[PDB]
Amino acid sequence: PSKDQLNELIQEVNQWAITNGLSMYPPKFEENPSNASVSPVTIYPTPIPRKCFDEAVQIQPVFNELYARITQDMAQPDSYLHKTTEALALSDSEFTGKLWSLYLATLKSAQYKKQNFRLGIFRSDYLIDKKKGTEQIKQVEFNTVSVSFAGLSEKVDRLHSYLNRANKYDPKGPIYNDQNMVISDSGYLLSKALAKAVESYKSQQSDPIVAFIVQRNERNVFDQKVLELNLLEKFGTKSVRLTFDDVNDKLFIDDKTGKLFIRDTEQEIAVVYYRTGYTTTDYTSEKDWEARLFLEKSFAIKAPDLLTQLSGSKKIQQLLTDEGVLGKYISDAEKKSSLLKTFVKIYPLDDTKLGREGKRLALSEPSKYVLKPQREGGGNNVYKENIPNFLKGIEERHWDAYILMELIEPELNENNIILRDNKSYNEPIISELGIYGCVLFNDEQVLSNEFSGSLLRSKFNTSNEGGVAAGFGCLDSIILY
Amino acid sequence: PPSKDQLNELIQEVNQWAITNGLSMYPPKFEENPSNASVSPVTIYPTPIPRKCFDEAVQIQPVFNELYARITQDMAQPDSYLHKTTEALALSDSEFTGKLWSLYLATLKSAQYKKQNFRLGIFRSDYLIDKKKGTEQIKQVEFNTVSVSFAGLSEKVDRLHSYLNRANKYDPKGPIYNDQNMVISDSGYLLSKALAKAVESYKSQQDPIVAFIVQRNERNVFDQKVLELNLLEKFGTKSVRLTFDDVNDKLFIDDKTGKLFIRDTEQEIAVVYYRTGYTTTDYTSEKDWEARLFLEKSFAIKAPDLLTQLSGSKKIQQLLTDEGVLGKYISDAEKKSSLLKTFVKIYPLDDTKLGREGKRLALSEPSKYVLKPQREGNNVYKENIPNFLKGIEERHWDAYILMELIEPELNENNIILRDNKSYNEPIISELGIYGCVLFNDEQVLSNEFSGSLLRSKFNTSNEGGVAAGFGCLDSIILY
Numbered sequence: 013p014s015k016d017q018l019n020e021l022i023q024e025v026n027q028w029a030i031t032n033g034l035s036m037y038p039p040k041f042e043e044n045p046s047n048a049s050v051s052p053v054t055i056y057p058t059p060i061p062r063k064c065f066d067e068a069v070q071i072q073p074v075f076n077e078l079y080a081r082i083t084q085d086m087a088q089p090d091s092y093l094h095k096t097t098e099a100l101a102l103s104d105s106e107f108t109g110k111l112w113s114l115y116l117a118t119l120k121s122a123q124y125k126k127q128n129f130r131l132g133i134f135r136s137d138y139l140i141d142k143k144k145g146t147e148q149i150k151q152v153e154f155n156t157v158s159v160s161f162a163g164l165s166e167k168v169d170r171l172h173s174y175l176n177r178a179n180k181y182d183p184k185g186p187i188y189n190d191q192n193m194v195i196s197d198s199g200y201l202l203s204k205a206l207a208k209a210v211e212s213y214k215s216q217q218s219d220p221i222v223a224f225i226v227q228r229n230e231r232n233v234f235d236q237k238v239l240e241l242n243l244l245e246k247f248g249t250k251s252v253r254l255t256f257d258d259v260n261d262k263l264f265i266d267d268k269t270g271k272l273f274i275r276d277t278e279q280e281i282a283v284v285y286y287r288t289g290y291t292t293t294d295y296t297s298e299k300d301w302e303a304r305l306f307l308e309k310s311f312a313i314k315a316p317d318l319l320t321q322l323s324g325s326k327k328i329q330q331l332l333t334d335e336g337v338l339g340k341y342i343s344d345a346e347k348k349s350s351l352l353k354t355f356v357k358i359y360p361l362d363d364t365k366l367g368r369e370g371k372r373l374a375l376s377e378p379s380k381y382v383l384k385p386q387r388e389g390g391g392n393n394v395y396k397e398n399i400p401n402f403l404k405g406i407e408e409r410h411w412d413a414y415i416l417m418e419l420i421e422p423e424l425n426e427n428n429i430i431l432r433d434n435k436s437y438n439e440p441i442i443s444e445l446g447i448y449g450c451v452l453f454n455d456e457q458v459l460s461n462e463f464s465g466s467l468l469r470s471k472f473n474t475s476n477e478g479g480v481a482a483g484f485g486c487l488d489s490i491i492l493y
Numbered sequence: 494p495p496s497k498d499q500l501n502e503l504i505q506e507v508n509q510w511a512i513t514n515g516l517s518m519y520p521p522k523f524e525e526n527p528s529n530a531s532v533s534p535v536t537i538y539p540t541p542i543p544r545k546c547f548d549e550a551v552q553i554q555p556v557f558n559e560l561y562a563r564i565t566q567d568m569a570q571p572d573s574y575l576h577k578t579t580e581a582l583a584l585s586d587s588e589f590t591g592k593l594w595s596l597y598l599a600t601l602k603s604a605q606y607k608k609q610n611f612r613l614g615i616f617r618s619d620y621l622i623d624k625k626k627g628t629e630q631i632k633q634v635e636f637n638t639v640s641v642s643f644a645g646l647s648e649k650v651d652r653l654h655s656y657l658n659r660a661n662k663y664d665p666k667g668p669i670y671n672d673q674n675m676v677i678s679d680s681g682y683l684l685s686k687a688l689a690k691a692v693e694s695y696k697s698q699q700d701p702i703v704a705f706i707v708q709r710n711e712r713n714v715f716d717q718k719v720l721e722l723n724l725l726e727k728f729g730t731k732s733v734r735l736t737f738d739d740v741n742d743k744l745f746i747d748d749k750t751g752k753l754f755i756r757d758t759e760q761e762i763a764v765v766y767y768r769t770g771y772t773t774t775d776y777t778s779e780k781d782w783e784a785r786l787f788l789e790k791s792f793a794i795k796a797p798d799l800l801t802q803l804s805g806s807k808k809i810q811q812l813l814t815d816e817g818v819l820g821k822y823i824s825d826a827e828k829k830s831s832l833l834k835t836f837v838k839i840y841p842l843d844d845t846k847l848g849r850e851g852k853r854l855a856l857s858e859p860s861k862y863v864l865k866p867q868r869e870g871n872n873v874y875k876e877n878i879p880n881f882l883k884g885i886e887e888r889h890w891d892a893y894i895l896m897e898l899i900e901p902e903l904n905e906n907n908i909i910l911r912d913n914k915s916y917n918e919p920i921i922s923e924l925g926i927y928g929c930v931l932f933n934d935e936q937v938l939s940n941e942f943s944g945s946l947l948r949s950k951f952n953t954s955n956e957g958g959v960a961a962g963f964g965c966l967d968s969i970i971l972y
């Protein structure tokens with residue numbers, strides 16, 4: 013775009029975004045939460061092959077079923093996966109081990125029937141791998157807890173649709189075919205899933221609510237608000253926002269039924285939906301771990317419960333790459349095949365046959381991999397030629413704290429513009445396709461399993477006047493081709 | 494009354510719902526970073542308004558629309574009292590009215606194309622609920638004929654309060670209000686529908702757009718955006734935002750047809766909708782006055798055009814209080830009576846008989862009035878009136894009107910929220926009713942009620958300062 017065209021387009025974006033709540037709190041918003049900023053976004057949609065997008069959408073229920081079955085297997089105290097997971101958890105005592113200890117505590121006898129239905133609100137993330145001309149969605153990871161952006165996704169998609177249909181991209185007319193402009197309904201669909209869990213809770217017995225368990229001073233609250241509003245306006249269901257402090261201070265469990273209530277209001281909580289509790293810093297003291305256990309012991313349906321959260325571990329992602337292991341959870345030949353083609357090679361770094369080969373590859377051909385820690389979210393992946401130096405810096409026995417993953421090689425989009433805090437950036441971006449999926453299941457049955465929308469997160473990483481390794485992520489949208 | 498904790502939670506509920514829904518405004522100096530905005534100043538709860546009063550205000554709007562459409566049509570005629578009255582006002586206020594009048598005269602010159610005679614009045618009638626000796630009656634503060642605000646944010650504050658009620662935020666145990674009594678304005682949609690109607694009239698005379706003429710660095714952009722989005726999503730009509738600089742730099746008129754176009758895009762403008770040009774500071778140089786004349790001479794339908802804007806003067810408001818004058822525009826006895834019931838006494842301060850009566854009253858019983866400058870925060874109230882008048886030459890008192898003071902009851906049970914701070918102060922609430930009327934030199938083609946608004950404000954001397962206070966958007970609970 014010209015200089016003047018870009019500036020007018022930027023103000024069109026800020027204006028539409030603010031009018032529609034496509035927003036996020038800035039750092040230190042605590043000082044004045046009556047103000048918010050436009051969420052970081054691209055100005056144009058990013059091209060994604062229609063074949064790739066359709067494949068991602070179609071396989072989501074298969075992934076939902078797979079992770080539900082894995083969770084169910086983990087839920088059997090006498091199973092091999094239960095032992096396997098305990099072993100992995102004990103290796104990460106500061107986080108995974110604490111989650112595991114809470115889970116063991118839920119196995120103790122209760123005076124009431126326990127809640128066995130759980131809701132998995134998931135997101136499968138992909139990079140479109142391009143090797144020797146073959147284009148194939150490849151899974152980066154599978155998210156099983158507190159997945160973000162279902163609400164803002166709907167809004168960035170509608171922002172770009174608007175700019176196209178309202179002749180803002182070009183005053184003479186649309187520059188895109190609206191039939192190729194993806195418009196996610198992920199906000200509505202996640203709310204529908206939460207309502208489904210409420211339906212399940214009621215069927216086991218009243219105007220129960222959904223308790224949103226949130227991070228203290230959460231900056232991404234407007235993304236979450238879309239779900240709170242949809243639950244009320246579309247599903248007539250109320251909700252509350254509770255931090256771990258609020259859980260400890262305001263909730264109680266009825267000893268005879270296990271039902272969860274807000275003390276001074278008598279509101280009954282049907283579903284505990286987590287938007288916090290996925291990284292060590294989310295638990296600021298032993299009291300927060302106690303709060304999580306309290307919620308997990310109650311009769312409310314958790315979204316997700318402890319085991320479902322634990323099923324999304326990098327170790328399990330690695331394990332599933334073995335066709336024999338996969339087949340213990342998905343026996344359908346075609347589903348199994350469909351799943352395997354979205355996987356790249358992933359190796360453990362332990363003393364097993366596979367682990368020894370991973371160690372050999374990590375040192376001999378590091379350029380082809382990314383070393384990823386089993387404890388998630390720390391932003392500590394180690395790439396390519398940097399791998400040997402990192403590994404040599406720690407005892408070989410501790411290499412098991414990581415997995416070695418084949419590097420996915422997507423094409424970069426060189427024709428988009430990123431907007432953040434009224435500043436634009438013309439840099440090449442990598443785009444990660446997210447597909448939401450929600451599955452309601454218990455110890456053995458699966459009651460609802462659906463595709464729940466899409467997301468496209470893009471980011472750039474460059475060294476320029478903005479700094480070395482400058483760059484950040486933003487919400488993008490999809491134009492199919 | 495909310496406890497500290499309950500109020501603090503309710504305040505965050507409001508901030509969160511407001512930001513998520515665009516119930517927002519730019520703060521001062523937002524120009525430094527327009528990617529950031531604040532929650533609009535709003536009340537936490539709705540304010541009680543008698544159902545009878547609300548219904549009366551809604552039902553009378555089309556009558557006021559017709560009245561001002563007729564006044565505007567009369568003003569076009571050289572021999573009418575109004576035409577003449579306006580001329581005098583153009584001398585008294587040559588810096589503003591005088592300049593608008595001169596532009597109007599300039600539009601009377603011949604053109605080589607057929608001129609556009611349809612105009613769209615997007616009005617708002619504002620009321621205070623007078624309470625004198627147990628007599629409850631809506632009384633008109635003023636009638637606004639140009640660039641009326643808040644139709645978009647009105648919808649949102651009404652929906653904010655409805656949500657707080659239905660989502661058990663006002664009370665965790667259930668709703669505290671009957672939803673049947675909670676007014677939910679559709680003024681954003683209805684103003685957009687009126688603009689679409691003007692577009693329809695423009696097309697009937699031949700994919701044109703609506704040009705929003707806006708103030709440079711407008712802080713109330715989100716209120717306007719509601720209309721832009723509705724025009725597109727509900728009426729498939731595009732629009733652009735243009736300051737007077739943009740009008741001068743980017744638009745041209747086809748000499749043969751008078752049609753208005755954006756130069757390099759070829760977009761055709763069907764309607765010129767003003768959200769600026771109502772006060773002297775909106776015209777920063779002669780170039781802005783020229784930009785206004787350029788738009789007015791074009792074939793686009795103006796909302797409002799020059800004469801329609803001029804019809805909403807305080808002088809005309811004063812003249813209409815005489816039944817004989819009103820009767821020149823409204824012949825229906827019942828419509829006439831309904832209008833008169835909403836008027837308080839209003840006097841000139843010139844040397845006409847009524848004016849000399851006004852002067853007597855202003856000095857003998859000032860406590861019953863408010864002195865208002867004819868040019869549109871300069872009102873002078875009650876006992877402060879004599880001192881103010883004594884300070885200016887009597888011959889210039891004609892620059893004001895003397896209006897009976899409306900005395901509403903204050904709502905002492907609401908909380909005002911702005912920039913995260915709450916204020917628990919009594920407020921006065923002014924009911925606004927929007928109305929849109931499409932008309933030409935003689936016919937009135939569409940005339941509708943277009944929604945509601947409730948603006949509240951407080952004024953106190955306390956820890957926040959002397960005469961501290963500001964206005965905010967409120968909502969209505971009927972009873």
Ligand SMILES: Nc1ncnc2c1ncn2[C@@H]1O[C@H](COP(=O)(O)OP(=O)(O)NP(=O)(O)O)[C@@H](O)[C@H]1O
Nearest residue numbers: 152153382388389390391393417418419420421444
């Ligand atoms: N195999 C891969 N090939 C190429 N890039 C990758 C690969 N794996 C991860 N990445 C990049 O690294 C980012 C973070 O890796 P990811 O597995 O999502 O991390 P995390 O530790 O799980 N944290 P979080 O996303 O916050 O839960 C991704 O979004 C990608 O940009």
Ligand SMILES: Nc1ncnc2c1ncn2[C@@H]1O[C@H](COP(=O)(O)OP(=O)(O)NP(=O)(O)O)[C@@H](O)[C@H]1O
Nearest residue numbers: 621634635863865868869872896897898899900923
């Ligand atoms: N007759 C009255 N009785 C009581 N209060 C009044 C009266 N007239 C005006 N006011 C108050 O004064 C405010 C401003 O007066 P108003 O006539 O609305 O102003 P203005 O000069 O037309 N400008 P604007 O509203 O910015 O276009 C009103 O909203 C009222 O609060």
Ligand SMILES: N[C@@H](CCC(=O)N[C@@H](CS)C(=O)O)C(=O)O
Nearest residue numbers: 155157158159160227232287288
């Ligand atoms: N707590 C935040 C952020 C949660 C988060 O980090 N989610 C990651 C991991 S699942 C995502 O990629 O969505 C929220 O609720 O939006």
Ligand SMILES: N[C@@H](CCC(=O)N[C@@H](CS)C(=O)O)C(=O)O
Nearest residue numbers: 637639640641642708713768769
């Ligand atoms: N320029 C601003 C403000 C216009 C304005 O001041 N409107 C007054 C006078 S009509 C109102 O009371 O609505 C906007 O367009 O929102």
Ligand SMILES: [Mg+2]
Nearest residue numbers: 137152153155
């Ligand atoms: Mg990730």
Ligand SMILES: [Mg+2]
Nearest residue numbers: 153155388389
């Ligand atoms: Mg992760």
Ligand SMILES: [Mg+2]
Nearest residue numbers: 619634635637
């Ligand atoms: Mg006013």
Ligand SMILES: [Mg+2]
Nearest residue numbers: 635636637869
């Ligand atoms: Mg006025």
